[PDB]
Design a protein around this ligand. Structure first.
Ligand SMILES: CCCCCCCCCCCCCCC(=O)O
Length: 133
């Protein structure tokens, strides 16, 4: 179900990421470096466990989860959240909850590119990844 998302992906476009980070309370210096960073995202499965790595010259993260099963997560900006990832309309939807707040990280495939839409508050960021061979 999740197989077309699997592999290694490289950031090739970013819109409104500063808006998104600022909504989350990320400090100006972190936003400044992040705005010039191009992460690599690696999505792997082993049975129904998915592992999603984000690698960069600035911050690295890694999460493992089962679709539809809540997990604890500590984000790149150091939020401690309750998370769930599910498939919805063919999109990989990651919902994070903390302190009554929520953010969604939605991944979809369009013309072979991986489009990540990040929403928090009114901020909507779109980041595009292309697949590495
Ligand atoms: C990984 C780049 C550094 C961002 C660090 C501070 C903001 C983190 C915000 C939450 C995570 C965003 C992930 C964006 C993405 O995977 O392209």
């Amino acid at each position: 179900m999740v197989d077309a998302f699997l592999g290694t992906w490289k950031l090739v476009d970013s819109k409104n990421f500063d808006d998104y980070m600022k909504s989350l309370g990320v400090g100006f210096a972190t936003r400044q470096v992040a705005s010039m960073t191009k992460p690599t995202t690696i999505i792997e499965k082993n049975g129904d466990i998915l592992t999603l790595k984000t690698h960069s010259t600035f911050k690295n993260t890694e999460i493992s989860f089962k679709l539809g099963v809540e997990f604890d997560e500590t984000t790149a900006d150091d939020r401690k959240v309750k998370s769930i990832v599910t498939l919805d309309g063919g999109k990989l939807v990651h919902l994070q909850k903390w302190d009554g707040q929520e953010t969604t990280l939605v991944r979809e495939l369009i013309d072979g590119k991986l489009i990540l839409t990040l929403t928090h508050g009114t901020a909507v960021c779109t980041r595009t990844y292309e697949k590495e061979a």
